[PDB]
Design a protein around this ligand. Structure first.
Ligand SMILES: O=C(CO)[C@@H](O)[C@@H](O)CO
Ligand SMILES: O=C(CO)[C@@H](O)[C@@H](O)CO
Ligand SMILES: O=C(CO)[C@@H](O)[C@@H](O)CO
Ligand SMILES: O=C(CO)[C@@H](O)[C@@H](O)CO
Ligand SMILES: O=C(CO)[C@@H](O)[C@@H](O)CO
Ligand SMILES: O=C(CO)[C@@H](O)[C@@H](O)CO
Ligand SMILES: O=C(CO)[C@@H](O)[C@@H](O)CO
Ligand SMILES: O=C(CO)[C@@H](O)[C@@H](O)CO
Ligand SMILES: OC[C@@]1(O)OC[C@H](O)[C@@H]1O
Ligand SMILES: OC[C@@]1(O)OC[C@H](O)[C@@H]1O
Ligand SMILES: OC[C@@]1(O)OC[C@H](O)[C@@H]1O
Ligand SMILES: OC[C@@]1(O)OC[C@H](O)[C@@H]1O
Ligand SMILES: OC[C@@]1(O)OC[C@H](O)[C@@H]1O
Ligand SMILES: OC[C@@]1(O)OC[C@H](O)[C@@H]1O
Ligand SMILES: OC[C@@]1(O)OC[C@H](O)[C@@H]1O
Ligand SMILES: OC[C@@]1(O)OC[C@H](O)[C@@H]1O
Ligand SMILES: OC[C@@]1(O)OC[C@H](O)[C@@H]1O
Ligand SMILES: OC[C@@]1(O)OC[C@H](O)[C@@H]1O
Ligand SMILES: OC[C@@]1(O)OC[C@H](O)[C@@H]1O
Ligand SMILES: OC[C@@]1(O)OC[C@H](O)[C@@H]1O
Ligand SMILES: OC[C@@]1(O)OC[C@H](O)[C@@H]1O
Ligand SMILES: OC[C@@]1(O)OC[C@H](O)[C@@H]1O
Ligand SMILES: OC[C@@]1(O)OC[C@H](O)[C@@H]1O
Ligand SMILES: OC[C@@]1(O)OC[C@H](O)[C@@H]1O
Ligand SMILES: OC[C@@]1(O)OC[C@H](O)[C@@H]1O
Ligand SMILES: OC[C@@]1(O)OC[C@H](O)[C@@H]1O
Ligand SMILES: OC[C@@]1(O)OC[C@H](O)[C@@H]1O
Ligand SMILES: OC[C@@]1(O)OC[C@H](O)[C@@H]1O
Ligand SMILES: [Co+2]
Ligand SMILES: [Co+2]
Ligand SMILES: [Co+2]
Ligand SMILES: [Co+2]
Lengths: 249, 249, 249, 249
C-alpha cells in the first residue's frame, strides 16, 4: 500500500490551502503561480507522505514553493559578464513545509540563498564547509558560520538518513530574526519542527533559480548556456528527478 | 523659515513609527536597522517637508528605507567573475513613503530592482529607454515595458520638476500585483499618491546596493573596487549628496 | 457512496489548516480551541461535502468556528437583570467557510451578531423582517437594512433550497467594510463565493452564545435557566441536530 | 512651558499614523473613525506628553481609540429588559498606547471589557475586588482572578501616582494569549511598557460604551435613560473631563 502518486484532490487541497495561507501572510501570489509544479515531492518513495497526510508529523521530503520572481537580470550587463550572469539574477519564493517534512539535502553551484521565516520556526541543517569545483579557483569573503550541533532526536526520512551526514551544522530560525544567508556550494536542508502547530512559511530571496521544472518547460533563455541548465544537486538521487515533476493521479 | 535639518524628535518619531508599521506588516526589522541613516531627505531644500509634516501631502523628496539584507554573494564565485560581482549580490529593503512624497529620479549602473507593494499604492515614473555606457557593449533580454502616460495633475517637488522630464512611462502598482522589475540603467522614481490614507510600504528585492551611506561607513569590502563605490546617479545633484547623510538637530 | 461521517484525517487536516490560517491572520487561537467541535457539518446529508473536498466549490452546509470568548458578563449585574442576562454577554469567534459552502439559514432569539470580514468576501442572505415571539412585546430601534436582491445564479445545497426562501435580502461584505450587525430574531445565512481563491474568514462579535455543543458539555451555568439552553433555530431540522456534534470516523 | 493643548499637526500625525498601523494589522478602520475624538489626552496637565513626544517613553495618560462598533443591541429585546439594556450591547475598538503611556485608572458601572493584544505587550493594573453599588444587590459568577503583584520600577504619571493605589493586581498580556476579561465595577488601567519598540495595539470587545464624547454629540438614544449617560468613572477627576474632549490648537 505504498503511495506512488498524489490524487488530484490531495494536490489541489494541499496547494490551494498553502496559497491562501501565503495570501493571508501578504505574499503576492498570482493565479499562474498556483499550478501543478508548486507542490513538490522528492521521489516516488516520498509520496507515502500522503498516506497519513501533511499533518501526521512524519518525516518525508515534500514541500510547496510559490515563485513570484525569477529574473535573469541580464539586461544592462556588459557582454563580458555573460559567462557569469548565471551566478546572479533575482529570485523570490515562498516556501511552505508542514510539520516534520523536509526540503532535502542538496547544494547549488551558482545560487546563493537567504531565509526569512514568516510563520513557524525553521530548522536548517548544513555544511559550514563549502564544496570545491574541480579545476576552478573560487572567491571567498564571509563563508558560512559554524552554528550549533544538531539537537537530539531529529527524525529523518526513512531510507535517506545518510544523505544528511555532512550537514553537521544546525540553526533554528524564527520570525523577526536577521536574514540568514546560505552561500552557493554549501550543502543545506531544512524542516518544520514535527510539533509545530502551523506549517513553516519561509520567504526565500536568492540569485537566479536554474530549474527546468514542469512549469519551467516553455521559457526563453536569456543566454545560450542557461537553456535546460539545472543548478540543483541533491545528495539523494531519488530527489533530483522527482524534483522536476509531481505525479498527480 | 526654510528648514535645513530635522529635529531629533521629528527624526525618531518618523523612523520609529515607520519601523513599527514595518513590523506590523511582518518585515524583519532588527535594532541595528533602526538608525540615523534610515530616514532619507534628498537635499537641504527638501527638509521643508517637515515644515508642515509627513502627512501634509506636499511634494518633497524624502523616504525611509530599512535594509534587512545587502549580501555581496561573492563567496563561491569563480575568480573570473570578480570584475562583474558588483552587478550581482542580494539586497532586501522595506521602503516607506508618505503621501505626496517621492523617491527622486535616479538610475543605477549595476543594480537591478524589483518592487512588491505591501501597503498602499505605488506610482512609478521611469524611462522605458535604458541609458548607454560609453565604450562598453551591453546585453539585452527583456528590456522594460512601455507602460502608460502619466495621469493628469501630478504635483512634483518645487524646483525639481525638470528632473522628471525623461521618466515618461508610468505604472501604478498595488498589493498582490506581479513583481515589477526595474532593470539597471533605467531612470526611475516613485511616490505615494497624495490622497493615500496610509504611507506607501514597498518591499524592494535587488542586486547588491553600493551606497557609502552614514551607516555604511565602517564595513569590509569583499572586492577592492567595491570600496566606497557609489552606484546611485540622481538626476538632481542636490539629491546625490543628501542621500548619504541626514542632518539631525 | 453517500458520506455519513468525516475521517479523522479529513477532520484534523481541515481544522488544523484553518487554525493556521487563523493564526496567520492574527486571531488568538489557543490549543483548547482546536478541538473536535470546531469543524461543523450541519446534518448527515452534508458530509458529502468531503466526497470531493472543501475546494470543490460545491454547495454544502459546513464550516469552522474557533471560539476565543464566550463570556456571560453576569458579574456586577443587578439581580433584576437576571432573567435578561441571556440577551447579553460577549462572544468572539473566527469563522472559516470554504468556497461555495454555507452557514445555513437560522435565527437566534437572544443573540445579536456582527460581522467583520478578515479574508475573502462574505455573501449574507437574510430577512429584513424580524420574527415575533408569541405573547411578548419587543423593543425596536434600528431594525435591519433592506439590502439588495440576490445576485443571479446562487447555487444552494441540494435538498435545502427551500430553507433559504425567506432570506430575501442580500449583502456582500469585504475586508475593511463597516461592521455589519445581524440583530437577534432575524433569519440569516452566508456563504463564501464558489469562485473565491481563499476560504472566507470572518470575525464574529456577538452577545453570549447559548450552544450545548460537544465541547460545551461540561461547563458551569452562571444562571439556572442557561443550563442546556440552545439559542439556535435552524430552518432546516437536519441542521439543528448535526450542529451540536460532528461524526468523526 | 507646560503644554495645554496639542497642535493640529501633532494631532493629525498621531492619529493618522495610528490608523495606518491599525489598517496594517487588519482592523477595519473607516474614514469616519479617523476624527478629532480618536486621540485622547486625559486632562490638561497630560498635554505635556507632546512636550517630548509619543516616543519619549515618559509616563503620561493619553491614548488612541478607533471605534468600529458601538451597537445598543436593543432590537428584539423584550420590553422588560429595557432598564437593563444598558449593561449589554456590543462595542469593538482598537486601542493604541505608546511606550510608557497609560489608559488611566477608572471603572465602569455597566460595561464589561475584554482584551486581545494585537501588537506589543499590555501591562494591566486592576483591583481584583469589585466595587459595590449602594442599595442594589449584584450577581456574581466568576469574579476576577488575583493576578500577580506589580513588577518593580513602574513609572507612573507625575501627580497621579495615588490614583493607582487600589489597582494592586497586575497581569502582562501578549499576542496569542487567551482573551482577558475585565468585569464591570472593577478598577483598571494599563500601559505599554516604556522599553517597547512598538506602540501597544489592543482590540477591545465590550458591552455598550456610554461615552458622551465630542464625536458622540449628535446621536439618537435607543432608550430614554441612555441620553447623555456617561459610564466612565476615572479615579483622577482631571481625567474624567478631558476624556470627552481634546484641545487641538
Ligand atoms: O518568472 C517570473 C518573473 O520573474 C514570474 O512571472 C513567474 O515566476 C510566475 O510568477
Ligand atoms: O533551493 C531551494 C531551497 O534550498 C529552493 O529554492 C528550491 O530550489 C528547492 O528545490
Ligand atoms: O548587511 C547586512 C547583511 O546582508 C545586514 O546585517 C545589515 O544591512 C543590517 O540589517
Ligand atoms: O534604489 C532605490 C529605489 O529605487 C533604493 O534602494 C535606494 O537606493 C534609494 O536611495
Ligand atoms: O469560553 C471561554 C471564555 O470566554 C474560552 O476559554 C473558551 O471559549 C475557549 O476559548
Ligand atoms: O450564529 C452564528 C453565525 O450566524 C455562529 O456564531 C454559530 O452560532 C453558527 O452555528
Ligand atoms: O457606532 C457605530 C455602529 O456601531 C459606528 O458606525 C461608529 O462607531 C463609527 O465607526
Ligand atoms: O474602557 C476603556 C479601557 O478600559 C476604553 O474602551 C475607553 O472607555 C477608555 O476611555
Ligand atoms: O477543483 C479540483 C478538485 O479539488 O475539485 C473536485 C475534485 O475533488 C478535485 O480534486
Ligand atoms: O493547474 C491549476 C491547478 O489545478 O493546479 C494546482 C492548483 O490546485 C490549481 O487549481
Ligand atoms: O509557483 C512556483 C513554482 O511551483 O512554479 C514554477 C516553478 O516550478 C516553481 O516551483
Ligand atoms: O570537503 C569537501 C566536502 O566533502 O565537505 C563539504 C562539501 O559539501 C564537500 O562535500
Ligand atoms: O546527530 C546528528 C547527526 O549526526 O545524525 C544524523 C546526521 O548525519 C547528523 O549529522
Ligand atoms: O528618544 C528620543 C526622543 O524622541 O525622546 C525624547 C526627545 O524628544 C527625543 O526626540
Ligand atoms: O541611532 C538609534 C536611533 O536614535 O536612531 C533612529 C531611531 O530613532 C533610533 O532611536
Ligand atoms: O536600515 C536601512 C539603512 O537606513 O541603514 C543602513 C543604510 O544606510 C540603509 O539606508
Ligand atoms: O537616449 C538616452 C537617454 O537620454 O534616454 C534614456 C536614458 O535615461 C538616457 O538618458
Ligand atoms: O505630464 C507628465 C510630464 O510630461 O510632466 C512632467 C514630467 O516630465 C512628465 O513627463
Ligand atoms: O494527527 C492525526 C492524523 O492527522 O495524523 C495521522 C492520521 O492520518 C491522523 O488523521
Ligand atoms: O481534539 C484535538 C484534535 O485532535 O481535534 C481537532 C484537531 O485536529 C486536534 O488535533
Ligand atoms: O473553538 C470553537 C468551538 O468549536 O469550540 C467549542 C464550541 O463548540 C465552538 O464551536
Ligand atoms: O412575518 C414573520 C416571518 O415569517 O417573516 C420573517 C420572520 O423570519 C418570520 O418568519
Ligand atoms: O433568487 C433568489 C431566491 O428567490 O431564490 C432562492 C431563495 O429563496 C431566494 O429568495
Ligand atoms: O492635514 C493636516 C496637516 O497635518 O497638514 C498640514 C498641517 O501641518 C496640518 O497639521
Ligand atoms: O476630522 C478629521 C481629521 O482632521 O481629524 C483627525 C484626523 O487627522 C483627520 O484628518
Ligand atoms: O473612532 C473612535 C472614537 O474616537 O470616535 C468616536 C468616539 O469618541 C471614539 O473615541
Ligand atoms: O472595597 C471596596 C473598594 O474600595 O475596593 C475595590 C473597589 O474598587 C472599591 O473601591
Ligand atoms: O508597587 C506597586 C504599587 O504599590 O505602587 C503604586 C501602586 O499603588 C501599586 O499598588
Ligand atoms: Co537550496
Ligand atoms: Co533605485
Ligand atoms: Co447566527
Ligand atoms: Co475601561
Amino acid at each position: 500500500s505504498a503511495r506512488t502518486s498524489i490524487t488530484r484532490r490531495e494536490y489541489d487541497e494541499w496547494v490551494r490551502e498553502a496559497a491562501a495561507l501565503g495570501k493571508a501572510l501578504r505574499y503576492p501570489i498570482t493565479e499562474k503561480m498556483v499550478n501543478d509544479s508548486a507542490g513538490i515531492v522528492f521521489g516516488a518513495d516520498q509520496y507515502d507522505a500522503f498516506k497519513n497526510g501533511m499533518w501526521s508529523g512524519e518525516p518525508y521530503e515534500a514541500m510547496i514553493i510559490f515563485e513570484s520572481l525569477n529574473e535573469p537580470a541580464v539586461d544592462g550587463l556588459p557582454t563580458g559578464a555573460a559567462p557569469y550572469a548565471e551566478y546572479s539574477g533575482l529570485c523570490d519564493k515562498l516556501m511552505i513545509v508542514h510539520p516534520g517534512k523536509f526540503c532535502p539535502p542538496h547544494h547549488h553551484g551558482r545560487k546563493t540563498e537567504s531565509y526569512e521565516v514568516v510563520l513557524g520556526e525553521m530548522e536548517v541543517f548544513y555544511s559550514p564547509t563549502p564544496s570545491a569545483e574541480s579545476g576552478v579557483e573560487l572567491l571567498n569573503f564571509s563563508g558560512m558560520p559554524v552554528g550549533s550541533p544538531w539537537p537530539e532526536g531529529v527524525a529523518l526520512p526513512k531510507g535517506r538518513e545518510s544523505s544528511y551526514e555532512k550537514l553537521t551544522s544546525y540553526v533554528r530560525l524564527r520570525a523577526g530574526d536577521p536574514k540568514f544567508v546560505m552561500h552557493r556550494k554549501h550543502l543545506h536542508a531544512f524542516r518544520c519542527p514535527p510539533d509545530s502547530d502551523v506549517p513553516l512559511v519561509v520567504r526565500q530571496v536568492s540569485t537566479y533559480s536554474h530549474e527546468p521544472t514542469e512549469a519551467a518547460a516553455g521559457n526563453h533563455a536569456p543566454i545560450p548556456s542557461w537553456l535546460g541548465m539545472h543548478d540543483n544537486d541533491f545528495v539523494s538521487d531519488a530527489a533530483n528527478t522527482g524534483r522536476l515533476q509531481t505525479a498527480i493521479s
